[PDB]
Amino acid sequence: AFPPGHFKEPKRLYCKNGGFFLRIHPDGRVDGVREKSDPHIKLQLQAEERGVVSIKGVLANRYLAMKEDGRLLASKIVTDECFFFERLESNNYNTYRSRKYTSWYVALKRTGQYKLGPKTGPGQKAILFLPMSAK
């Protein structure tokens, strides 16, 4: 598990697939971008309970959610679709697994689009995110 401080400061989440940072747009679209200065990739992780986080786009003021068909969007209000198990994998990247749809992961495709929940799974490059400083 992670200590305090992981949650104190905002983060960028760097995806192994394509080198995309996870981006939360003002209108609730979620996607990836390679540019580290994009203002919409500054995220805030918040511990909801042990090993569970919500992920907020700071500038968008919206929380990452995974929907029942597997799509990603970001909502103004926190709901049960906004919670993820955060786990450090053996390769030192993290995964984010839906607490509601427990086989599905937050993931980005090589195109920059999100990858639909049902196509995700362990061992994919698409599900691996490295948190780092937002500075």
Numbering used by the authors: 20 to 154
Quote the study's own text.
The FGFR-FGF-HSPG complex induces the dimerization of FGFR, resulting in a series of intracellular signaling cascades including the activation of MAPK/ERK pathway, PI3K/AKT pathway, and PLCγ pathway, etc. While the therapeutic potentials of FGF2 are widely recognized, a significant challenge hindering its broader application is inherent instability.
To improve the thermo-stability of FGF2, we designed two mutants harboring four-point mutations: FGF2-M1 (D28E/C78L/C96I/S137P) and FGF2-M2 (D28E/C78I/C96I/S137P) through bioinformatics, molecular thermodynamics, and molecular modeling. We successfully solved the high-resolution (1.40 Å and 1.48 Å, respectively) crystal structures of FGF2-M1 and the FGF2-M2/SOS complex. The RMSD value between the structures of the FGF2 mutants was 0.144 Å for all Cα atoms, indicating that the introduction of mutations did not affect the overall structure of FGF2. The D28E mutation is situated at the end of the N-terminal loop (residues 20–28 in the structure of FGF2-M1) independent from the β-trefoil fold of FGF2. The B´ value of the N-terminal loop was 2.82 Å2, suggesting that the region could be structurally disordered and easily exposed to protease. Structural analysis of the model structure showed that the side chain of D28E was at least 7.5 Å away from the surface of FGFR1c, indicating that the mutation at position 28 only confers resistance to fragmentation of FGF2 without affecting its interaction with FGFR1c. P137 is located at the end of the β11 strand and contacts with the side-chain indole ring of W123, positioned at the beginning of the β10 strand. Therefore, S137P seems to improve the thermo-stability of FGF2 by anchoring the beginning and end of the β10–β11 hairpin such as a knot.
